[PDB]
Design a protein around this ligand. Structure first.
Ligand SMILES: *C(#CC(=O)[N]C1=[C][C]=C(O[C][C][C])C([C][N]C(=O)C2=[C][C]=C(C3=N[C]=[C][C]=N3)[C]=[C]2)=[C]1)C1=[C][C]=[C][C]=[C]1
Length: 258
């Protein structure tokens, strides 16, 4: 029943709103300069960084990087909450549950981080601030280009013009990918995704009727994502040897063991 699908879609979008305090709709009101109460502090140089700690809530490149690190722990929490709401997810093998989040967390983080970017920079601290692409990019080696690729993916991704309701389904599709390393029972996972894929199909058709083959165009983005992830992990591994005086959060480090 399509009705059965639209209901799954409402359900999902619902959980998405509940789990994720900074939606893409809110992000874009902030980035388009909608209102006079939502205007971010703009961070584009070192004194702006300084003053920005006063208006919004060790070394510079390092303080920024750990600024992402605590963030990503937050995201993981968020995603974990969402995951629990996906029909079936919690019933699966527990060792599978862990696996799916372990490989799905980053790919989701980058999908939703795009919501907060535009071609000039990225929103930080729940929309209170905005760090310009150029500043990030001038960050010393090897922190210069830890964010560059993410921008590239976002600008491409953001042009598909998805909205929150589309994304809720799409991050559910990611979580339930039967092709993840160490998965115990794959079938039960794929049966849930099949439904998710099915929902997303209908969703995109209804919501974006003039967006031809969007559904397939969206599905191929999963390759760009994976690419970004591997580039990430690699970059971290160099960070960890140049910077033996630098910590990684426990939750984060569980995710990284392969
Ligand atoms: C990444 C992304 C971001 O860049 N996110 C980000 C980056 C930098 C900062 O701040 C830099 C100094 C101003 C922030 C702001 N948030 C924090 O660092 C932070 C907020 C709150 C707390 C705290 N709150 C209550 C009690 C105690 N502490 C601490 C720190 C945000 C990135 C890269 C790749 C993927 C995703 C994200």
């Amino acid at each position: 029943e399509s009705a059965d699908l639209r209901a799954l879609a409402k359900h999902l979008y619902d959980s998405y709103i509940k789990s994720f305090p900074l939606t893409k709709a809110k992000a874009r009101a902030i980035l388009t300069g909608k209102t006079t109460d939502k205007s971010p502090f703009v961070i584009y140089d070192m004194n702006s960084l300084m003053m920005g700690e006063d208006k919004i809530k060790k070394e510079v490149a390092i303080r920024i990087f750990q600024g992402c690190q605590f963030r990503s722990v937050e995201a993981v929490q968020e995603i974990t909450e969402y995951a629990k709401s996906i029909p079936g997810f919690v019933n699966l093998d527990l060792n599978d549950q862990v696996t799916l989040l372990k490989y799905g967390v980053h790919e989701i983080i980058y999908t939703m981080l795009a919501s907060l970017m535009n071609k000039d920079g990225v929103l930080i601290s729940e929309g209170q601030g905005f760090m310009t692409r150029e500043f990030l990019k001038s960050l010393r080696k090897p922190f210069g280009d830890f964010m560059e690729p993410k921008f590239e993916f976002a600008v491409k991704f953001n042009a598909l013009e998805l909205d929150d309701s589309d994304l809720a389904i799409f991050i559910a599709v990611i979580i339930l990918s039967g092709d993840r390393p160490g998965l115990l029972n794959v079938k039960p996972i794929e049966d849930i995704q099949d439904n998710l894929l099915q929902a997303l199909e209908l969703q995109l058709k209804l919501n974006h009727p003039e967006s031809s083959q969007l559904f397939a165009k969206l599905l191929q983005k999963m390759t760009d994502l994976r690419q970004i992830v591997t580039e990430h992990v690699q970059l971290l591994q160099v960070i960890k040897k140049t910077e033996t005086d630098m910590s990684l959060h426990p939750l984060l480090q569980e995710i990284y063991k392969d």
